[PDB]
Amino acid sequence: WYTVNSAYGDTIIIPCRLDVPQNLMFGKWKYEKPDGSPVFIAFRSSTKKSVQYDDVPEYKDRLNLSENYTLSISNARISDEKRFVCMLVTEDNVFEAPTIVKVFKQPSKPEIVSKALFLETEQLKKLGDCISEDSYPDGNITWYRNGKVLHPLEGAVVIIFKKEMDPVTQLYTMTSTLEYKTTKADIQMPFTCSVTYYGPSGQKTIHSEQAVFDIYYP
Ligand SMILES: *[C@@H]1O[C@H](CO)[C@@H](O)[C@H](O)[C@H]1NC(C)=O
Ligand SMILES: *[C@@H]1O[C@H](CO)[C@@H](O)[C@H](O)[C@H]1NC(C)=O
């Protein structure tokens, strides 16, 4: 299970992962549908040096099959997250090698929006919505009070999370609503949020700017 990690919008470089055989006739690249059905996308003849791309609109003007059978896909999309197979064909044999492609799109810097004009003591109020957009894969939202993680607590800290996918791009938008019961200790205290996600270089976290609220009490 060899994997190629690519950032959204970059060129995906997929080497064949096969030794060049003696008596090579041609090579072909294909991708597998979710249930394993094959779709051929590129062809290269070793004898004629010709290059042909199958009529697959999803890959129109996006492929380049080099002389050593490396397939390059331009402008990485979420639909490119598939298993690709390099097939080398000789006069009496077929050799196949798969490569898993994973695509990553960095979530937007989170922002606290739809903010309360003021928080009320002994009353649960919607502090705001922490939104992080156009991400792939989805991310986890954490809330903080004075730079310290704010965990849920019955009748005091209620966190309502949702992840929505755009059906055309397959990118995620994460929204975390914080319903909060303030105290006078929150006078001039900053509230922030962050998004934790997996990218090509591993697990990363991006923090938001702070939000300070006027605390009202009877
Ligand atoms: C040879 O393969 C490498 C990847 O292993 C690729 O970067 C290079 O462009 C290829 N060269 C040719 C001439 O196909
Ligand atoms: C998000 O949280 C879940 C647990 O709820 C965890 O399994 C997952 O690895 C977390 N994702 C990231 C990007 O850390």
Author numbering: 28 to 245
What do the authors report?
Recombinant His-tagged proteins of human CD6 SRCR domains 1–3 and human CD166 IgSF domains 1–3, i.e. the two N-terminal V domains and one C domain (CD166 VVC), were stably expressed in Lec 3.2.8.1 Chinese hamster ovary (CHO) cells, purified, and deglycosylated. Only the first two domains could be resolved in the electron density map. The crystal lattice did not contain space to accommodate the third domain, suggesting it had been proteolytically cleaved prior to crystal growth. We mapped previous mutagenesis data that defined residues in CD166 domain 1 critical for CD6 binding (Skonier et al., 1996a, 1996b) onto the crystal structure. Mutations in the A′GFCC′C″ face, which disrupt CD6/CD166 interactions, map to the crystal contacts between the two N-terminal domains in the CD166 structure (Bowen et al., 2000). If the heterophilic and homophilic binding sites overlap, as implied by the CD166 crystal contacts, homophilic CD166 interactions would be disrupted by the formation of heterodimers with CD6.
CD6 is a transmembrane protein with an extracellular region containing three scavenger receptor cysteine rich (SRCR) domains. The membrane proximal domain of CD6 binds the N-terminal immunoglobulin superfamily (IgSF) domain of another cell surface receptor, CD166, which also engages in homophilic interactions. CD6 expression is mainly restricted to T cells, and the interaction between CD6 and CD166 regulates T-cell activation.
